[PDB]
Ligand binder design. Structure first.
Ligand SMILES: Nc1nc2c([nH]c(=O)n2[C@@H]2O[C@H](COP(=O)(O)OP(=O)(O)OP(=O)(O)O)[C@@H](O)[C@H]2O)c(=O)[nH]1
Ligand SMILES: Nc1nc2c([nH]c(=O)n2[C@@H]2O[C@H](COP(=O)(O)OP(=O)(O)OP(=O)(O)O)[C@@H](O)[C@H]2O)c(=O)[nH]1
Ligand SMILES: [Zn+2]
Ligand SMILES: [Zn+2]
Lengths: 245, 245, 245, 245
């Protein structure tokens, strides 16, 4: 009576090396794990060591399948009817060379969750994409030139089916006025202006475009899209988000 | 070209100094503000300048009523049906050492949110109370000693009636194995050490014990209680939360 | 023999409200304090409560004089021949209106140190200034428009004599292609492009210009100047610094 | 127009995945890189693209020698007399629980720096070891219990000879009231709790005890030892450092 069920309990912010397999190759990274389960009213404690125990044992590559695998095994190991694992980490993508084979690397911040309710599995995903946004109402008053600044686009979402980290990166960068590339001389600098100068976007635009994509994709049962446009003109961001449904 | 509502759009993390009135006095602090409005589909973009305007003008001491006032004035100006203000800040309170009674400030992190949805007002608040936790497992099994650590309890709740920040602080501080003070003399430090060793609590115990107090407060419609213990024997945290309902 | 003198010891990251007096008015803020003293080889411990004790007692406005005052009083209170106090906090500046009396606020991150060696006082200062830098080699390849991004300029320095937080802000913004103002319509936006478009600067330029000022000022016995130009084109900064002498 | 040398100029916080070789094995981690060169007075600007180039090309396991190799290759390419590379990263090591012997990784933060000054090479390294501290004052004065907390010991040193990261870890872990492990079973947790209560240490004691070990290592020319204890009875830290010489 006095004691209540605890929605979730376990470890949080355990920093752990993970080798990650996505559909454009395997890569090694450093993740930060949160791992928890439902604890019923009559049980005083969960078992804290078993969460770390699980991760130490499982040196298998982490993909969508392996994340289900761990999460079901977790509820198993700790004798609970529910629980979640989250894995946050930087994710790197190789961008092949638009000039002579000089291809740069770009870093993204990604976070995968896996959840077991009673036997039912559910997964969700969060990905932050840094982009170079350009303003179209700052080119409208100025005869020449415009207000350019770095902007971040986060995309949180839930699906029944597997959805690649990169598919989401791409969903976002497609709409990007111009995305972040690696330093290449004169050649790669000419067409970074013109792509963002004649089609520039606001914080409101960026969320709409990305949302439109996300509505289309029947796998995505729900999402949130945030864009943050760090005004160079003030020490504070322009911000907007959309949730669906 | 466009056909998508934006749930919220505005400025985020405007860092702004403020003067705050609470039951126990008035203080000067520094705040992060996020302020945003609903944006209808065919409307292309909100009016970013107007947020900042609103805040430069109002020099009024912040208080439950003032937040309401400010959030209704915000949807008015930017001409919108719904909107949100959130103000985050360190909050100070004067404490009394338990034996010697020497006075010292302790610091807390607060976030207060006002929301308007078609004339209706809601306010929620988040508060973070650092306290001490001491492990009952370590106490029991050991011929002496008990590992203890600083821990963050974070309460978020919603209410129609105003709940004082200090009120949420007392609910937590009371239940903590023991609480923190800036100033302690030998007898004080003797007191607190022994207090913790007498009243050990799992992360489960804290959130449970705090949740109950909250449930016993008719004003509170909903809450989350989190407790993170930065285990002094691990390099990760123990973590638990209860959500009501 | 086995035990050594400890250069410094005390409290670190004590978060405390301070009312700060500079030569353009008094303002209230929230500071983070580090406070320490030399501990000789024969002494096992310092006195940790006295650092907090001092701050609780002294509710006098903090200016250059008051910071000496505290620092000498500190070594006194804790019976040591040396020690330092540092105070970090955000500092706000009122920027009067270039159009009809609509004047915005901008936040800066400042940090003041005070040190007593044997009786000799020494002070130093650190100030981070956010600026809107524009590139002049990105306007050189493009016929119209250029690569604009937010950049941060930190200025650390030591003086015999008082040097105002604002004098340093100004030293930096003078050289600024354009500095951060508050949102004003059409009027204030026209001359934010032209000031940074015809005189744009790199990371190397910004450090040189600011250094030149700092060499001039006979009060400044030494400094460091850092500029960080967060490339919107990559998730990593362009960086440079100069130390003198 | 210009007449001022720049001590260092380059890119900062390039976030890059790496493979690292140490005495006890080879691991995959993620790194922040800062790379910079000396810039002579009348030379206007360094060549930012070339830093990134250098790193995309070299896929070699990182190791003491490789850092040297990389920093000499860097001044070569950018055509400069002096320069600095610094690589920061989480570092993992496999530990053995003290009683049960169960294996678990603990995580550390390392920063390795190479510097070239006119053909001469220097390397320094910084390392942060989380450990447990337990107060001897609290132990003494109290009829039972001792407040303890997690604490960060941070060692920075310079040497002509290579010092293994794990070597610096062992110097600290040994002196800690007790050390951390990811996995502990009851007997293990019993062990560590009791170990700390037996070997209590002021922040003064730790840095002192660790400093001595360092002094006893002819390879180390200079060092700083810091220890921050996140006091479980306060909301600020105790802090001390020794600098040699
Ligand atoms: N549930 C819980 N356990 C904790 C906390 N802090 C803490 O040190 N522990 C340690 O973790 C233990 C929980 O059980 P455990 O994971 O070691 O597993 P167990 O001994 O119950 O059985 P096992 O050997 O089958 O895993 C407690 O007995 C205690 O020693 C906490 O806040 N909550
Ligand atoms: N020096 C030191 N003191 C500590 C640490 N941790 C800690 O709790 N303390 C507490 O702080 C005390 C240091 O003295 P204090 O500031 O209370 O002053 P005091 O009792 O020596 O004399 P006072 O009453 O004249 O100030 C210790 O006795 C201890 O209870 C630490 O790491 N170093
Ligand atoms: Zn325990
Ligand atoms: Zn103590």
């Amino acid at each position: 009576l006095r004691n209540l069920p605890i929605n979730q309990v376990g470890i949080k912010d355990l920093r752990f090396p993970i080798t990650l397999k996505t559909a454009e190759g395997t890569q090694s990274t450093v993740a930060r794990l949160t791992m928890t389960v439902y604890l019923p009213a009559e049980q005083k404690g969960t078992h804290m060591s078993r969460f770390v125990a699980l991760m130490e044992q499982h040196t298998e590559v982490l993909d969508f399948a392996q994340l289900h695998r761990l999460t079901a095994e977790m509820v198993a190991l700790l004798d609970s009817r529910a629980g979640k694992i989250s894995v946050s980490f930087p994710f790197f993508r190789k961008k092949t060379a638009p000039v002579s084979g000089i291809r740069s690397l770009l870093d993204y911040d990604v976070s995968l969750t896996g959840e077991m309710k009673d036997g039912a599995y559910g997964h969700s995903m969060k990905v932050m994409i840094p982009v170079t946004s350009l303003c179209p109402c700052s080119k409208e008053i100025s005869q020449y030139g415009a207000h350019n600044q770095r902007s971040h686009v986060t995309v949180s979402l839930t699906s029944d089916a597997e959805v690649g980290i990169e598919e989401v990166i791409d969903y976002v960068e497609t709409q990007a006025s111009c995305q972040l590339y690696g330093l290449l001389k004169r050649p790669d600098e000419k067409y970074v202006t013109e792509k963002a100068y004649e089609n520039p976007k606001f914080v409101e635009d960026m969320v709409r475009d990305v949302a439109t994509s996300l509505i289309a994709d029947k796998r995505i049962k729900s999402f949130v899209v945030e864009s943050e446009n760090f005004e160079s003109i003030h020490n504070h961001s322009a911000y907007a988000y959309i949730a669906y449904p």
